[PDB]
Scaffold this motif. Structure first.
Motif, PDB file in Angstrom:
ATOM      1  N   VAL A 255       0.845  -1.181   0.000  1.00  9.49           N
ATOM      2  CA  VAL A 255       0.000   0.000   0.000  1.00  9.49           C
ATOM      3  C   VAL A 255       0.883   1.234   0.000  1.00  9.49           C
ATOM      4  CG1 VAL A 255      -1.911   1.232   1.214  1.00  9.49           C
ATOM      5  CG2 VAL A 255      -1.845  -1.305   1.142  1.00  9.49           C
TER       6      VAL A 255
ATOM      7  N   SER B 229       3.091   3.917  -3.135  1.00  7.83           N
ATOM      8  CA  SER B 229       4.192   3.898  -4.116  1.00  7.83           C
ATOM      9  C   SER B 229       5.222   4.996  -3.881  1.00  7.83           C
ATOM     10  CB  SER B 229       3.637   4.060  -5.520  1.00  7.83           C
ATOM     11  OG  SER B 229       3.004   5.360  -5.703  1.00  7.83           O
ATOM     12  N   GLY B 230       5.311   5.504  -2.683  1.00  5.11           N
ATOM     13  CA  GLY B 230       6.416   6.388  -2.380  1.00  5.11           C
ATOM     14  C   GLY B 230       7.749   5.635  -2.235  1.00  5.11           C
TER      15      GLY B 230
ATOM     16  N   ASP C 269      -1.819   2.498  -5.249  1.00  9.04           N
ATOM     17  CA  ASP C 269      -1.719   3.836  -4.794  1.00  9.04           C
ATOM     18  C   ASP C 269      -3.039   4.550  -5.018  1.00  9.04           C
ATOM     19  OD1 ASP C 269      -0.904   6.758  -4.427  1.00  9.04           O
ATOM     20  OD2 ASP C 269       1.101   5.865  -4.057  1.00  9.04           O
ATOM     21  N   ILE C 270      -3.429   5.337  -4.034  1.00  7.37           N
ATOM     22  CA  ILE C 270      -4.689   6.124  -4.151  1.00  7.37           C
ATOM     23  C   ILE C 270      -4.576   7.249  -5.180  1.00  7.37           C
ATOM     24  CG2 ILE C 270      -4.117   7.782  -2.268  1.00  7.37           C
ATOM     25  CD1 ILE C 270      -6.925   7.418  -1.143  1.00  7.37           C
TER      26      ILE C 270
ATOM     27  N   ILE D  36       4.785  22.246  -5.401  1.00  7.89           N
ATOM     28  CA  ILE D  36       4.688  21.588  -4.122  1.00  7.89           C
ATOM     29  C   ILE D  36       3.388  22.040  -3.396  1.00  7.89           C
ATOM     30  CG2 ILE D  36       5.695  21.609  -1.888  1.00  7.89           C
ATOM     31  CD1 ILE D  36       8.492  21.966  -3.225  1.00  7.89           C
TER      32      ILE D  36
ATOM     33  N   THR E 168       0.509  14.057   0.150  1.00  9.88           N
ATOM     34  CA  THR E 168       0.626  14.088  -1.286  1.00  9.88           C
ATOM     35  C   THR E 168       0.104  12.733  -1.781  1.00  9.88           C
ATOM     36  OG1 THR E 168       2.573  15.536  -1.314  1.00  9.88           O
ATOM     37  CG2 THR E 168       2.174  14.164  -3.274  1.00  9.88           C
TER      38      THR E 168
ATOM     39  N   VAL F 122      -0.068  11.016  -5.062  1.00  5.42           N
ATOM     40  CA  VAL F 122       0.371  10.830  -6.408  1.00  5.42           C
ATOM     41  C   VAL F 122       1.291   9.607  -6.401  1.00  5.42           C
ATOM     42  CG1 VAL F 122       0.327  13.252  -7.211  1.00  5.42           C
ATOM     43  CG2 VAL F 122       2.447  12.234  -6.172  1.00  5.42           C
TER      44      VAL F 122
ATOM     45  N   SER G 194       8.120  11.821  -2.737  1.00  6.02           N
ATOM     46  CA  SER G 194       9.428  11.770  -3.420  1.00  6.02           C
ATOM     47  C   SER G 194       9.369  12.392  -4.829  1.00  6.02           C
ATOM     48  CB  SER G 194       9.989  10.356  -3.478  1.00  6.02           C
ATOM     49  OG  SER G 194       9.376   9.648  -4.527  1.00  6.02           O
TER      50      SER G 194
ATOM     51  N   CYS H 192      15.481  15.926  -1.265  1.00  5.71           N
ATOM     52  CA  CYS H 192      16.466  14.909  -1.408  1.00  5.71           C
ATOM     53  C   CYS H 192      17.596  14.872  -0.379  1.00  5.71           C
ATOM     54  CB  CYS H 192      17.075  14.939  -2.825  1.00  5.71           C
ATOM     55  SG  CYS H 192      15.840  14.834  -4.168  1.00  5.71           S
TER      56      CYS H 192
ATOM     57  N   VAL I  89      -6.349   3.680  -6.574  1.00  8.31           N
ATOM     58  CA  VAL I  89      -6.958   2.623  -5.788  1.00  8.31           C
ATOM     59  C   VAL I  89      -6.797   2.977  -4.301  1.00  8.31           C
ATOM     60  CG1 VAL I  89      -7.003   0.281  -5.081  1.00  8.31           C
ATOM     61  CG2 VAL I  89      -6.708   0.829  -7.503  1.00  8.31           C
TER      62      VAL I  89
ATOM     63  N   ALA J  95       1.954   3.888   3.416  1.00 11.90           N
ATOM     64  CA  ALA J  95       1.045   4.932   2.973  1.00 11.90           C
ATOM     65  C   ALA J  95       1.360   6.256   3.641  1.00 11.90           C
ATOM     66  CB  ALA J  95      -0.364   4.530   3.224  1.00 11.90           C
TER      67      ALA J  95
ATOM     68  N   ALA K  11      13.631  24.273  -3.003  1.00  7.03           N
ATOM     69  CA  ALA K  11      12.172  24.608  -3.030  1.00  7.03           C
ATOM     70  C   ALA K  11      11.348  23.853  -1.978  1.00  7.03           C
ATOM     71  CB  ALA K  11      11.606  24.334  -4.446  1.00  7.03           C
TER      72      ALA K  11
ATOM     73  N   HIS L  40       8.024  16.048   8.805  1.00  2.00           N
ATOM     74  CA  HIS L  40       8.997  15.059   9.297  1.00  2.00           C
ATOM     75  C   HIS L  40       8.363  14.204  10.446  1.00  2.00           C
ATOM     76  CE1 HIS L  40      12.918  17.000   7.500  1.00  2.00           C
ATOM     77  NE2 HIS L  40      12.128  16.449   6.598  1.00  2.00           N
TER      78      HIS L  40
ATOM     79  N   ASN M  86      16.869  14.666   8.622  1.00  4.12           N
ATOM     80  CA  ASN M  86      15.753  14.297   7.764  1.00  4.12           C
ATOM     81  C   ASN M  86      15.564  12.767   7.768  1.00  4.12           C
ATOM     82  OD1 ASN M  86      17.984  16.047   6.560  1.00  4.12           O
ATOM     83  ND2 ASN M  86      16.218  17.097   5.506  1.00  4.12           N
TER      84      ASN M  86
HETATM   85  C1  FAD Z   1       8.700  19.579  -0.341  1.00  2.00           C
HETATM   86  C2  FAD Z   1       9.165  18.522   0.652  1.00  2.00           C
HETATM   87  C3  FAD Z   1      10.549  18.399   0.762  1.00  2.00           C
HETATM   88  C4  FAD Z   1      11.057  17.361   1.583  1.00  2.00           C
HETATM   89  N1  FAD Z   1      12.415  17.188   1.631  1.00  2.00           N
HETATM   90  C5  FAD Z   1      12.903  16.049   2.167  1.00  2.00           C
HETATM   91  C6  FAD Z   1      14.352  15.731   2.214  1.00  2.00           C
HETATM   92  O1  FAD Z   1      15.075  16.711   1.979  1.00  2.00           O
HETATM   93  N2  FAD Z   1      14.694  14.694   3.037  1.00  2.00           N
HETATM   94  C7  FAD Z   1      13.852  13.834   3.633  1.00  2.00           C
HETATM   95  O2  FAD Z   1      14.297  12.788   4.140  1.00  2.00           O
HETATM   96  N3  FAD Z   1      12.535  14.045   3.454  1.00  2.00           N
HETATM   97  C8  FAD Z   1      12.062  15.231   2.979  1.00  2.00           C
HETATM   98  N4  FAD Z   1      10.692  15.249   2.693  1.00  2.00           N
HETATM   99  C9  FAD Z   1       9.842  14.113   3.189  1.00  2.00           C
HETATM  100  C10 FAD Z   1       9.864  12.798   2.415  1.00  2.00           C
HETATM  101  O3  FAD Z   1       9.245  13.162   1.202  1.00  2.00           O
HETATM  102  C11 FAD Z   1       9.045  11.696   3.111  1.00  2.00           C
HETATM  103  O4  FAD Z   1       9.480  11.335   4.417  1.00  2.00           O
HETATM  104  C12 FAD Z   1       9.043  10.423   2.283  1.00  2.00           C
HETATM  105  O5  FAD Z   1       8.558  10.740   0.931  1.00  2.00           O
HETATM  106  C13 FAD Z   1       8.217   9.340   3.028  1.00  2.00           C
HETATM  107  O6  FAD Z   1       8.019   8.267   2.115  1.00  2.00           O
HETATM  108  P1  FAD Z   1       6.862   7.171   2.272  1.00  2.00           P
HETATM  109  O7  FAD Z   1       7.029   6.256   1.078  1.00  2.00           O
HETATM  110  O8  FAD Z   1       6.753   6.627   3.681  1.00  2.00           O
HETATM  111  O9  FAD Z   1       5.530   8.063   2.166  1.00  2.00           O
HETATM  112  P2  FAD Z   1       5.033   9.001   0.995  1.00  2.00           P
HETATM  113  O10 FAD Z   1       6.048   9.557   0.025  1.00  2.00           O
HETATM  114  O11 FAD Z   1       4.075   9.948   1.645  1.00  2.00           O
HETATM  115  O12 FAD Z   1       4.164   7.951   0.111  1.00  2.00           O
HETATM  116  C14 FAD Z   1       3.047   7.262   0.615  1.00  2.00           C
HETATM  117  C15 FAD Z   1       1.989   7.115  -0.464  1.00  2.00           C
HETATM  118  O13 FAD Z   1       0.907   6.211  -0.178  1.00  2.00           O
HETATM  119  C16 FAD Z   1      -0.258   6.821  -0.699  1.00  2.00           C
HETATM  120  N5  FAD Z   1      -1.492   6.475   0.001  1.00  2.00           N
HETATM  121  C17 FAD Z   1      -1.813   7.222   1.073  1.00  2.00           C
HETATM  122  N6  FAD Z   1      -2.940   6.666   1.548  1.00  2.00           N
HETATM  123  C18 FAD Z   1      -3.279   5.591   0.768  1.00  2.00           C
HETATM  124  C19 FAD Z   1      -4.309   4.709   0.846  1.00  2.00           C
HETATM  125  N7  FAD Z   1      -5.223   4.780   1.815  1.00  2.00           N
HETATM  126  N8  FAD Z   1      -4.443   3.767  -0.111  1.00  2.00           N
HETATM  127  C20 FAD Z   1      -3.515   3.681  -1.126  1.00  2.00           C
HETATM  128  N9  FAD Z   1      -2.442   4.511  -1.169  1.00  2.00           N
HETATM  129  C21 FAD Z   1      -2.338   5.467  -0.244  1.00  2.00           C
HETATM  130  C22 FAD Z   1       0.082   8.138  -1.354  1.00  2.00           C
HETATM  131  O14 FAD Z   1      -0.658   8.609  -2.411  1.00  2.00           O
HETATM  132  C23 FAD Z   1       1.579   8.129  -1.516  1.00  2.00           C
HETATM  133  O15 FAD Z   1       2.021   8.011  -2.835  1.00  2.00           O
HETATM  134  C24 FAD Z   1      10.183  16.303   1.973  1.00  2.00           C
HETATM  135  C25 FAD Z   1       8.804  16.358   1.656  1.00  2.00           C
HETATM  136  C26 FAD Z   1       8.299  17.460   0.958  1.00  2.00           C
HETATM  137  C27 FAD Z   1       6.857  17.421   0.362  1.00  2.00           C
END
Ligand code: FAD
Ligand code: FAD
Lengths: 576, 575, 52, 104
Positions: free
Chosen positions: B9, B11-12, B33-34, B64, B115, B117, B122, B127, B238, B277, B410, B505, B550
């Motif tokens: 669940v 695609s981040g 992914d939703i 953003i 977010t 998408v 990511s 980064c 989804v 998610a 940014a 964070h 981070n």
């Molecule tokens: C502008 C900004 C800059 C940042 N800079 C950094 C950086 O410099 N360093 C750092 O470490 N982090 C930073 N971050 C944070 C980092 O993006 C996140 O910690 C990281 O993307 C977490 O990844 P994840 O895969 O757990 O979750 P996410 O990237 O949030 O992905 C989870 C996902 O699951 C989905 N989803 C949610 N609910 C459901 C559901 N019910 N059913 C199906 N799918 C679902 C979403 O659509 C999404 O694609 C930044 C974030 C932003 C927006």
């Protein structure tokens, strides 16, 4: 990349995609180049608003638009910042900072003008309004025969409408839409007629609208492919097109000079036919970088020899804007057929109506929506359902009111809708003026300053003409204030105003159409062919030579379809 | 085949870590992914990697803003008393415009957002991928700090490969070096300055390919020509709604989904279930499945399953400012030049001696400066127009327990304007660590629902009194003291605390520990939900410590360890 | 407010703020000319603008 | 609580208050014009150390009030201008206008 094609198209916006649809479909070997990149998802060139998430959050789309619009000409900044710390490096002059254009007079600009460089162009984020022009706004396609002229335009507009999937009833179940349309219709007592804005869109469900785009016109997939095995089309993104090479004779284009942004390399591309659909601004820049018109600040002691009308007679529409908060009267009127007993929240609270009663002022389906919302959401003080679609109302341009109107909700670079007033109450008013074409209004290109793609820097020299354009603009402002008052008062923070010149993004006349280059002061004929050249065609709003208030894209597409008929008739596809 | 070995669940980047590991290891993987694919042909790629955005970087801020949807917005109480008399005018501050009536506006993380998408956040992050030092780091091994260090070093090394983390993509920025060298000089050895470790590969002097989920795993359906024996399907749009518990609470039996396009709902079967998610939505999905407690917390009725879920939440304090480079630093850029005459005049010249040992700067720098000053005599600065941005950090230490970034990039806030030359401007972001406290919670309404008809998230949060608060202020003071060594504040970007959760964070929402009871936690060190054979959680929600740096690299490292456990304990189905 | 009302600026340089949303009918300047008591001698970047 | 820290400025010949021979003020007198920058060197180094001291010191009392964050005020808003007709013992040697009896 092959380097030889039947047709090359510069730009993947809706107009380029018109030439692609017609010419790939006619069996031509087609290549299309775009300086920008594929981003819209698996549907190449599609509308970015067509995600479930944007449609649940349509105010955020305003940020998407703001991010992709890059200002055309930013003058040098003269804001005084005198609270820097004494240790900070501090300027002695207002020097050229941050990509600004020293050629640009800040007081004769279209500061709101901007472009979008992505595959599908601005159709990845546009508001999809596609009205026809009546005679008064439209250039002639047949001379000295108005019936024949009307017939030809109706033929071309009909085809353009089917390409965009234009319709006028996608919002017909909205309570807000009908409330507003019906009130305006009544107030004007036939003095003016109101209708849904014609929109390039197909509704998929009560909460999702598939907005049209370039992708709707042509899916931009490489061909041949399974679904089109005998067609030939290649899209090349991240390719800056820099020149069309003229022969010395100026009778033909011999190649297209391109720069691949990813590898860095430059190549020369060969076709039988060259089509430039890079937009009103960038078509002109390309042609000027290739030796048409004249580079540098206009000098009438020194008039260009090729296409001397290029980049003169430019038009941009005056735009006024406000938002309103729906009147108490109109809100009460939504629920006029309900009988109400008790107090919301009490056990015996009751909202009822009699289906089919001759005394009802609304159809059953409307009363059902109202009653259900009021009963299911007794905490909410409005009768309008939470996911009611937006109002999409117009009264079209007429001699007596010579401006286009939109009374609606949609996303634009400036739309900021806020948080303290319920969005169900809010309506947007955008009235669009027509601008007379005047020789002195110009788009020219620096011989010294270059833009971010090392091309000559666009510079505007523009003011709204005095006389009719200016008198109409202010009467137009007045008409917005008069008309909107019939619906509600102005929303604080969105009071009636003129928008920065060009923010409207309806620039025309930069490479204008007409019958005769000299007499009609123009660049292309009614086949959109550049005068003197056997095989160079221009599409887009820059073709439109008249003063128009309505949204130009449908009209530009219709000119493009006519251009394609000339091409099909005069060049032979290569054997496949 | 609505039966899979593994379902993921989200695609981040963390879901994509599980996909990379497990697809690679022969598992029949499905990912849902939703949100939708909206990033180009490279699925889940960084939206910053277009030529147009890299030539207009300040515009990415708008992208953003557009994709971050607020998690919990309280009821708006602003007074608008200048409506026309004819306009409908409220008599109360009722629930308008999707606001959350459960939310106390004074105990919120108002800046928290998500977010939706493909690729998750990511597709737009900055980064930065630092390692946590021991003080900020969760324990993987109890009572053997050498063994703990070794496990983390291995996992982090593998995570840095996955992300393409590097530390010298900016080494040829004049601005970067100007700032780094001055700071190192000023701290006289008390602190170490280095490039921010960044998940990125430079392609040319004006283009950097920022890493994303796509970098970790390409998200292409498999088998395909490049991976003929792999099995992967990605299903965008989804909404995943519940994982179904057996009665024993020992196994997940089904994932219930809602296809947003067709509108239909389905029950998907897998051997292994991975929730990635995000810190907010993993918690939402679990609560909607019967883990924890739904509704407003009630001490007198503690949940029987996973009682610590959604408690001990942490978010970092964030302070920010921009500065305008000092006149001293700008002059020092040209310290090696001999400059005669007046710019724009015949007699003007700028020279330096190549390779001279008395030069402060290397030849590449002096060449760039010489050419800029000679070719652009109308420009008053010695810094070349296309100089890359600074990317400086001094990492968290005991004596300065905050992460620092001294840079340009940014984010949703803090855009520039046009009055001060961009080349003079530097961003300062200092990130505090937050003590985990049981009273800081993320919970979900039993009556209000969100835009996907799921229980509405609601925060009950304040920065802990004591250490956390004292360090936050000491952190602000530290930023003011350090930034002053580079230049004064940029007006309109003065030193300030950012709205709680803007920093994005958020941790500790489904936290990790050795023992469910004793470490007040929801997953073990294999990221497995206590008592459940086949349910795993990935992401920042797992992190149980107070951390400033981070979090994403550390979450990715935890995900790799989780994958190792899956690989040891489940067999891929036959292909 | 009392303080703000009685302090009269010593030297106000010529204003160069761009106002490009005037109605097309409104009289619109072609240059940044000396308006509203301003001091054309004053360099805006070498002032004590707060002096009054 | 309000924090106002006030720096000292070195007197430099080049920092001037002069009067137009063409432009007049609202009382038909020659228009004052400034030509001023904070001197580099000590004045500027002190000003920024001063900013830092305000931030360091004020933190001991509370955080900054949103909307009143640490800043330099527009030059002259402080209204403590001096040295425009300066005192000293000797007109030439002390570069001055009046003696210690304030006599011109
Ligand atoms: C502008 C900004 C800059 C940042 N800079 C950094 C950086 O410099 N360093 C750092 O470490 N982090 C930073 N971050 C944070 C980092 O993006 C996140 O910690 C990281 O993307 C977490 O990844 P994840 O895969 O757990 O979750 P996410 O990237 O949030 O992905 C989870 C996902 O699951 C989905 N989803 C949610 N609910 C459901 C559901 N019910 N059913 C199906 N799918 C679902 C979403 O659509 C999404 O694609 C930044 C974030 C932003 C927006
Ligand atoms: C938010 C918004 C709302 C709008 N709403 C409406 C509407 O309601 N109704 C209406 O009619 N109009 C509307 N418009 C305008 C409409 O989008 C444009 O008129 C239309 O897209 C023009 O089509 P085009 O194909 O000529 O150019 P574009 O859509 O501008 O496409 C031209 C393209 O060529 C490219 N290009 C530029 N230079 C080069 C080069 N040198 N080499 C290679 N490629 C190049 C670009 O990257 C781009 O994709 C709106 C626009 C905006 C942005």
């Amino acid at each position: 990349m092959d380097i030889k094609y039947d047709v090359v198209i510069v730009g993947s916006g809706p107009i380029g995609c018109t030439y692609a649809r017609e010419l790939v479909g006619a069996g031509y070997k087609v290549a299309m180049f775009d300086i920008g990149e594929i981003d819209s998802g698996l549907k190449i060139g599609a509308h970015k608003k067509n995600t479930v998430e944007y449609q649940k959050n349509i105010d955020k789309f305003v940020n998407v638009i703001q991010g992709q619009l890059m200002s055309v000409s930013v003058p040098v900044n003269t804001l005084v910042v005198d609270t820097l710390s004494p240790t900070s490096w501090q300027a002695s002059t207002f020097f050229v900072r941050n990509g600004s254009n020293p050629e640009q007079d800040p007081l004769r600009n279209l500061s709101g003008q901007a472009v979008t460089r992505v595959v599908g162009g601005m159709s990845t984020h546009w508001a999809c309004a596609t009205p026809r022009f009546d005679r008064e706004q439209r250039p002639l396609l047949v001379k000295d025969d108005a019936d024949a002229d009307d017939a030809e335009w109706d033929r071309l507009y009909t085809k353009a409408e089917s390409y965009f999937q234009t319709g006028t009833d996608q919002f017909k179940e909205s309570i807000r839409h009908n409330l507003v349309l019906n009130k305006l219709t009544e107030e004007y007592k036939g003095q003016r007629d109101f209708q849904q804005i014609p929109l390039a869109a197909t509704r998929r469900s009560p909460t999702f609208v598939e907005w049209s785009s370039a992708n709707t016109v042509f899916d931009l997939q490489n061909r041949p492919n399974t679904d089109a095995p005998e067609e030939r089309f290649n899209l090349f993104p991240a390719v800056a097109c820099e020149r069309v090479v003229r022969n010395a004779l100026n009778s033909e284009i011999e190649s297209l000079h391109i720069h691949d942004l990813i590898s860095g390399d430059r190549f020369e591309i060969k076709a039988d036919v060259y089509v430039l659909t890079a937009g009103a601004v960038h078509n002109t820049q390309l042609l000027v970088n290739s030796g048409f018109g004249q580079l540098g600040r206009p000098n009438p002691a020194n008039p260009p020899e090729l296409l001397p009308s290029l980049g003169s007679y430019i038009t941009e529409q005056s735009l006024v804007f406000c938002q309103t908060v729906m009147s108490t009267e109109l809100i009460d009127s939504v629920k006029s057929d309900m009988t109400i007993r008790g107090t919301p929240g009490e056990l015996t609270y009751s909202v009822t109506y009699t289906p089919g009663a001759s005394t009802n002022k609304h159809p059953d389906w409307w009363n059902e929506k109202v009653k259900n919302h009021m009963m299911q959401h007794q905490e909410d003080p409005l009768p309008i359902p939470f996911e009611d679609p937006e109002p999409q109302v117009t009264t079209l341009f007429q001699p007596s009111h010579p401006w286009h109107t939109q009374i609606h909700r949609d996303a634009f670079s400036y739309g900021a809708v806020q948080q303290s007033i319920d969005s169900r109450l809010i309506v947007d008013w955008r009235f669009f003026g027509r601008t007379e074409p005047k020789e002195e209004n110009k788009l020219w290109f620096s011989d010294k300053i270059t833009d971010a793609y090392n091309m000559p820097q666009p510079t505007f020299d523009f003011r709204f003409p005095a006389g009719r354009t200016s008198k109409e603009a202010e009467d137009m402002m007045t008409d917005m204030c008069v008309m909107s008052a019939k619906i509600g008062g102005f929303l604080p923070g969105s009071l009636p105003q003129f928008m920065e010149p060009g923010l409207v993004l309806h620039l025309g006349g930069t490479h204008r159409m007409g019958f005769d280059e000299k007499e009609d002061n123009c660049c292309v004929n009614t086949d959109s062919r550049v005068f003197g050249f056997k095989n160079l065609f221009l599409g887009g709003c820059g073709n439109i030579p008249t003063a128009y208030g309505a949204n130009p894209t449908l009209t530009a597409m219709s000119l493009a379809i006519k251009s394609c008929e000339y091409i099909k008739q005069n060049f032979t596809p290569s054997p496949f």
